[PDB]
Design a protein around this ligand. Structure first.
Ligand code: XJR
Ligand code: XJR
Lengths: 412, 412
């Protein structure tokens, strides 16, 4: 009953829409696509040749060239986001507080690019060509590791990996740490860069990607009757979470309050969701109960909304189960229509968009929703952003293994 | 103040000492090595040609051949352990409780073997030869995913990846879930199978492995003055954690109580620890305070004890900082002397050994401790197991990124 309150004091991001939060959010509010033909590798033999890339990233803004060549791109992206968020927070780390400052930055796949480059070296020339930085520069927990070293952070240090739910769980479990007194501040989010042959070929073999090579900006089409799978995107999201009285005492700017976190398992199938979204329903009901909110107080849902046939339907059903007749009053959108699917970073960037929807009183759009499929009759915010009253925003992520996560945010 | 108590009702394991908990523990109490020259691949060009392999594993005891060929060995090992633990618990999963039963099984590296096989296919023949099961059969969270599907578990479902701290954090964070009311039962632990060219070559390039090819059973030598790095081992550990009143009401056998979990960050270096083990000290003090135990009540520490020059010294210093003159009354050992380092599974198997030390009132040995190094003057249980009174056992894990975790166990 007497846990502590958690607010968002700082955010940061790289996405296919921009190298920070303001440029990303301007893209989102404008209905801009970040999806394009992939520049950095030869995809002649692959059925999908496009995705959301991070464009014009300069790691030397954040780290010396020396430090950065030790690190996979997913670590560089995660540190960029983390540093933007910590700067945006204005937090001063000292000897009196560094043990109360932790980090929870995850990833889905981790350093898959590095692993493939080092595999090339291994098979061509044998194990002598392997970098000595291969292990520490490629393992998932090294975003949390490096950030704690750079900022001197001595509180809880860990890394989730729960597929497309990674970002959501990382934030939720960091908020729990603060509420239960293990830390006063947490840096939390996720990052991903799986745009290599093993990623594109991995999701291609499973037949899970959109193959709309002719029109990449139209490929990601959540709830649309001609959807054909997800678009693979790269990037990172980070939030500075903080105990409310900590934030108030130092006069921090508060974007919003994190009131609710929920988890569930579908226990259904490795990749497919259940047709009724029964596990998504339970997860959302857990998050609302955790927040002490009735379903009728939710104004905006940032949906998972990946542009898959089964997925998108199951989310509509879940939302209709949870909210009932209130399903027709709230606005729900998929920013994956613009961003594509950022995998382990998806829930981190979507947590930020949900916070900014609270800040700006605006529901971002679902682009490409030309012909909503059977049952897709909610306010899906098709085509253009909708100014509206938003007191409570909810963010859903649902991943491989049937792992589900919801965050509930409230205007402060 | 009024959180719920957590007990261990079930355990399971594959290690280099056996295909279950009783055979593993018999090896440990006997001072048996599980380290040998690696049989399954040609290591001519590698500086280390040995490790701890799982021997005579039959996945068909646990899963159909059909299901098992979808899965990396780390997933097979994690499911084997999980299933052994759930069976050992005697828990019956029903509609009334399945939402109160979760899973937290992690890994350090995940499906590194699968990734390398699929890289071979990719580079030889192009992306068409990639398995469609590559992604779901190789990602870390699929031990938690598959177990929830097999048993119908609908409670919190997630996966940590914190290097050599994975097993410890997975258990600790699962115990928190139960104590704070998110679940009544959790399956938690870790698994690893990184004995491929990228693993052995990865840790070799960094110069972190013992190169004692002439005498593999003597390579792992924690605190010994001729130690030269760790031994790479494979396996899995799983515990069924359970709210005490839940356990008592169904008449479960309780092995021990989980009273304490602690975390910290060194914030020092990517791989090296600080010479004083300052972060290990804080982590242990956090775990004891969490348990409401004075340092003087600790009887046994299952050490991290990896057989590295800097690591092993730093642990002695940390233990001398925390315990003071009581450092000379407790017994501390490294079961890595026998098992080698099981990476993300290390803390899960070591959690089980610590519980069994409580059960059997016996401190397992540190083998190969021929010549303790300068400062290594504690009761390190050199050579042979020591029957003794053990009311409180502590298990330490310390990983890459400076991530630290301690578990405190108490006789019930
Ligand atoms: C309400 O019902 C649902 C609606 C949608 C739904 O989509 C699940 C989803 O995104 N699954 C995953 C995909 C497609 N990827 C690529 N991925 C992943 C991420 C990182 C690393 C590995 C894999 C996923 O986890 C599920 C349920
Ligand atoms: C008290 O001070 C200390 C004593 C010992 C100490 O050892 C740290 C340690 O085990 N580091 C790691 C190693 C060697 N590996 C291979 N590994 C890992 C696991 C899974 C995947 C990737 C890497 C580690 O995390 C640190 C501190």
């Amino acid at each position: 009953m007497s846990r502590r309150r958690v607010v968002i004091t700082g955010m940061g991001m790289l996405s296919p829409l921009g190298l920070d939060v303001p440029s990303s959010w301007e893209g989102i509010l404008a209905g801009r696509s970040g999806i394009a033909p992939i520049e950095h590798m030869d995809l002649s033999a692959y059925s999908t040749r496009f995705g959301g890339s991070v464009k014009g990233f300069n790691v030397e803004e954040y780290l010396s060239a020396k430090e950065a060549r030790k690190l996979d791109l997913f670590i560089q992206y995660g540190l960029a986001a983390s540093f933007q968020a910590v700067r945006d927070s204005g937090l001063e780390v000292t000897d009196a507080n560094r043990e109360r400052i932790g980090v929870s930055m995850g990833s889905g796949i981790g350093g898959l690019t590095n692993i493939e480059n080092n595999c090339r070296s291994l098979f061509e020339q044998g194990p002598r060509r392997i970098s000595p930085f291969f292990v520490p520069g490629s393992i998932i927990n090294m975003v949390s590791g490096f950030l704690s070293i750079h900022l001197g952070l001595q509180g809880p240090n860990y890394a989730l990996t729960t597929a497309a739910t990674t970002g959501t769980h990382s934030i939720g479990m960091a908020a729990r740490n603060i509420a239960y007194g293990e830390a006063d501040v947490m840096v939390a989010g996720g990052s991903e860069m799986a745009a290599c042959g093993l990623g594109l070929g991995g999701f291609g073999a499973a037949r899970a990607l959109s193959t709309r090579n002719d029109e990449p900006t139209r490929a990601s089409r959540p709830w649309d009757r001609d959807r054909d799978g997800f678009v693979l995107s790269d990037g990172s999201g980070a939030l500075v979470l903080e105990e409310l009285e900590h934030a108030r005492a130092r006069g921090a700017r508060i974007y919003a309050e994190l009131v609710g976190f929920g988890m569930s398992g579908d226990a259904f199938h490795m990749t497919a969701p259940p047709e009724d979204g029964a596990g998504a329903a339970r997860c959302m009901k857990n998050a609302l109960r955790d927040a002490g909110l009735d379903p009728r107080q939710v104004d905006y849902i940032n949906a998972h909304g990946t542009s898959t046939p089964a997925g998108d339907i199951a989310e509509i059903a879940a939302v209709k189960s949870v909210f009932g007749e209130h399903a027709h009053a709230l606005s729900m959108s998929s920013t994956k229509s613009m961003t594509g699917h950022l995998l382990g970073a998806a829930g981190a960037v979507e947590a930020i968009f949900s916070v900014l929807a609270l800040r700006d009183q605006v529901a971002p759009p679902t682009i490409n929703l030309d012909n909503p499929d059977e049952g897709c009759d909610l306010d899906l915010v098709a085509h253009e952003a909708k100014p509206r009253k938003i007191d409570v925003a909810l963010s859903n992520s649902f991943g491989f293994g049937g792992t589900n996560g919801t965050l509930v945010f409230r205007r402060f």
